[PDB]
């Protein structure tokens, strides 16, 4: 997370950390708890070459990454079937936990948005995670969970900005319908935040608008953070996640 602050312990109870087995249970991506038994993340986090179920663990909300870990087993990994190398997109995945989490005030699910929610500019939105604090600058020990309020940029305005200073023709789309844009030169998600939630407060309730996906660097001019638009994937999510 670029800009922003350390999250108070009481905020973002749906934030998760995805771990891969090695010399230590290394954080590779963020995720969000969307159902007591299901984690939402980015496809690039777990695909295209999916690791064994034995090689992965889910860590629920923790204030300090690697301090007081309590790792949870996974029973299933589902990468969106349209995710593939040669196209940035369909960047969404699900992990089914072996057991539903016993939800508390400090650890619970995020509400998924209704299909009609477009999350227009002006909306109060926040992105959280344990990623880099700048380009090639690590979040330092004790690895506190960070948060940052990011402005939403309309898709067509965002796509035009990504065409500035590139070889890519105005003919072909860079920012697609299954994507959402947020962030500026002071506030953005960064490497290590991928898979994590972008949440907006709508009519008193926090809705997950996006999944940290990609960008060109972090907090760079004419390069806002790109997220997978959750509404676009609701029907796919609901083929696995009980409503």
């Amino acid at each position, epitope marked *: 997370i670029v800009g922003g602050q350390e999250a108070p312990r009481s905020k973002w109870p749906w934030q998760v950390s995805l771990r891969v087995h090695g010399p230590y249970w290394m954080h590779f991506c963020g995720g969000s708890l969307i159902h007591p038994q299901w984690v939402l993340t980015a496809a690039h986090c777990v695909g295209p070459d999916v*690791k*064994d*179920l*034995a*090689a992965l663990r889910v860590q629920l909300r923790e204030q300090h990454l690697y301090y007081q870990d309590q790792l949870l*087993p996974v*029973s299933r990994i589902i990468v969106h079937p349209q995710f593939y190398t040669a196209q940035i997109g369909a960047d969404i995945a699900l992990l089914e936990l*072996e057991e539903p989490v016993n939800v508390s005030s400090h650890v619970h699910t995020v509400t998924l948005p209704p299909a009609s929610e477009t999350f227009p500019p002006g909306m109060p939105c926040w992105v959280t995670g344990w990623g880099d604090v700048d380009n090639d600058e690590r979040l330092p020990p004790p690895f506190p969970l960070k948060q940052v309020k990011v402005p939403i940029m309309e898709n067509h305005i965002c796509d035009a900005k990504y065409h500035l200073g590139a070889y890519t023709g105005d003919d072909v789309r860079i920012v697609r319908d299954d994507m959402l844009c947020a962030g500026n030169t002071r506030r953005d998600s960064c490497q290590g935040d991928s898979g994590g939630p972008l949440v907006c407060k709508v009519n008193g309730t926090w809705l997950q608008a996006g999944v940290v996906s990609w960008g060109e660097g972090c907090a760079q001019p004419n390069r806002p953070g790109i997220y997978t638009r959750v509404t676009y994937y609701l029907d796919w999510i609901h083929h696995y996640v009980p409503k």
Partner: antibody
Amino acid sequence: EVQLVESGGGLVQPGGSLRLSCAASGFTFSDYGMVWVRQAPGKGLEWVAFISSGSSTVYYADTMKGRFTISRDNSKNTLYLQMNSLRAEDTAVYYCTRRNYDDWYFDVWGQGTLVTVSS
Amino acid sequence: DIQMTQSPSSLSASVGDRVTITCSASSSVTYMYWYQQKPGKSPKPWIYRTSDLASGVPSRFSGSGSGTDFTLTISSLQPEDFATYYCQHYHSYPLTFGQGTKVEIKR
């Protein structure tokens, strides 16, 4: 001593039903994933089923799905295998085995219980 | 889903011989697990996470491989190694075992 003891095997007619049970001792049973593995006489190990610590997750081999049901009773430290519509090809020793908590290999196995499906 | 093909189905080797058992997964997997089972006995964990030896397993045993190809090696075959060895993946459900390799000792 960490132990698993299977029971309930025996001779059953084709189309019959049988419930196998596996008594666990020496560990906190409710913390572990548990599985059934069978071995036909003179043949290899064949995975049957898996059940998570809290019973929310169950999986089966393709040829036994539907007909076999895995369950557990954590207050009784017991794992069960409900076998219905039994066929000659189900004849095997059925092993109860514990999934290692940290590394997921099957680290404790019972002595096994022989099931013979014949008329 | 993941299918295991183990080879050879049986072998006869001399004490002190280097013995290699192979296991092929139908699709790429992170780890390989191995079990030893003696006649009329129940299986025992032998190797896990491709190369980690279970407790009490002697260091003449080793495991290696990646992707779809894995092996179990005995650097110096011993009389007590007489057994059937099985490979097993833990990639996703359904789980499967390889067909086994029966090891006999020459004399």
